[PDB]
Design a protein around this ligand. Structure first.
Ligand SMILES: COC(=O)C[C@@H]1N=C(c2c[nH]c3ccccc23)c2cc(OC)ccc2-n2c(C)nnc21
Length: 108
């Protein structure tokens, strides 16, 4: 209960303007067609993004904090999985994950 309330606050920061410089690629699902990706959905089997997490939050689909954090980390993993480590989107994912993992750790 109060746990899921904290998760809601974390999500607002990930979407806040303070982190928009490196968090924008994760606002909406990967549009493989718009990006020219031909193997994204064959390799990434369970896509995830901040709007989908926000939706599941609003529909009260998360039962605890652990279920919420599982989706957020999966979002970063898909980015790490599909892209080589030298790509900048991986660096943006690492920057945003360090923000998430820090705030998530400071949860009561
Ligand atoms: C060429 O390879 C790709 O298109 C992969 C794709 N690239 C970026 C991106 C974002 N800054 C970048 C800098 C250099 C290279 C790629 C990028 C991107 C952009 C988006 O804007 C709507 C939305 C999703 C992503 N996104 C995610 C999340 N995970 N992978 C990708």
């Amino acid at each position: 209960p109060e746990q899921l309330k904290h998760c809601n606050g974390i999500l607002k920061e990930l979407l806040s303007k303070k982190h928009a410089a490196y968090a924008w690629p994760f606002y909406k699902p990967v549009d493989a067609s718009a990006l020219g990706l031909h193997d994204y959905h064959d390799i990434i089997k369970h896509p995830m993004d901040l709007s989908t997490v926000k939706r599941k939050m609003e529909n009260r689909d998360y039962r605890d904090a652990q279920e919420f954090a599982a989706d957020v980390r999966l979002m970063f993993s898909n980015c790490y999985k599909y892209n080589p480590p030298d790509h900048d989107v991986v660096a943006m994912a690492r920057k945003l994950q360090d923000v998430f993992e820090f705030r998530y750790a400071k949860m009561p």
